[PDB]
């Protein structure tokens, strides 16, 4: 019985009899969130909605629906440890998104609103639903922010050894690579299911925290490649954010051996980023982030991964050695 964790791509319309189904059951649990409140609001909307698919072949979420998906999807979500406070998400609706220059402000928007100059704060851009499968909006990076993976003479890193394909791509879509270790990526956008465009992030928008030595990290860890599922409609381009927790920040932009053996703590990190005011999840956070949470009071909504946008894409023409 366990299910995939992937949601692929699609040529075509989600058909009625399937998605239906799915909307009912959403609308459900929507107005489930009133017990006995909103009976004849309830059905109004289900007329609606399924008036609305059999006309158009399928539907629109209204922004409260969007809101409450975003936030389901996310205490949905098993691993993230962050879910404990669901209620503490800023939804930014980007579904009339059409370009990927506009794609680009949006995410602008995002870092800004998130970073907050340190005090971090959850958020989510939700992009056009998938309409037939064949005009996708996909983010490209898997996070909004990450550093440059280079490949070396010997077989060793410099930089992020998890963007080594990414970082490749990149370089092969015209982007210019410098070669450090904190070389932030540019956004690979995907608009309307187009060949990506590159569009390198305003140096202003990535807040850094500093840890020779030699290390620095961005503040802001924002999951960029996810899909959200929600009454059979699907965001194949939806990126959010929370703050870190410390206990990975991926310095695996390694040689770093610089008790038992495995004894690599995460010290410095809790300690940098406390004294450089941005937000972690230490004790307070956890203790705070859950009083706020506390204050505003087949898994569906859900956040799914995707097969690398790069392995699937048709190309068009656009950016060689694709
Ligand atoms: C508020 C701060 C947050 C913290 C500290 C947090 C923490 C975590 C951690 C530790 C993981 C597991 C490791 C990983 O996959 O990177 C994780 C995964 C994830 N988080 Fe968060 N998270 C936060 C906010 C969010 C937000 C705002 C969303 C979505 C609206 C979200 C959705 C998810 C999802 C979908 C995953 C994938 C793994 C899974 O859920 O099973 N998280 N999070």
Redo the contacts with the bound molecule.
Sequence with gaps: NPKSLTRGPRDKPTPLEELLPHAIEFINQYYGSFKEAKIEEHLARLEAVTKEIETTGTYQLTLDELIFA?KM??RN???????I?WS??QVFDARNCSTAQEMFQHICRHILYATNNGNIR?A?TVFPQRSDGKHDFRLWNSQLIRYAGYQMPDGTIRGDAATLEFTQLCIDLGWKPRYGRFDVLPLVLQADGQDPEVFEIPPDLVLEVTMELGLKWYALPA?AN?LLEVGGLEFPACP??????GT?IGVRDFCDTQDRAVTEINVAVLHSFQKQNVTI?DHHTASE?FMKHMQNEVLSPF?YYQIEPWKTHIWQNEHHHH
């Design positions: 975003t999807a996310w979500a098993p691993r993230c440890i962050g879910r406070q503490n998400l959850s989510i999951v996810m959010f954010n929370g703050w870190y927790m990975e999840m982030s956040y």
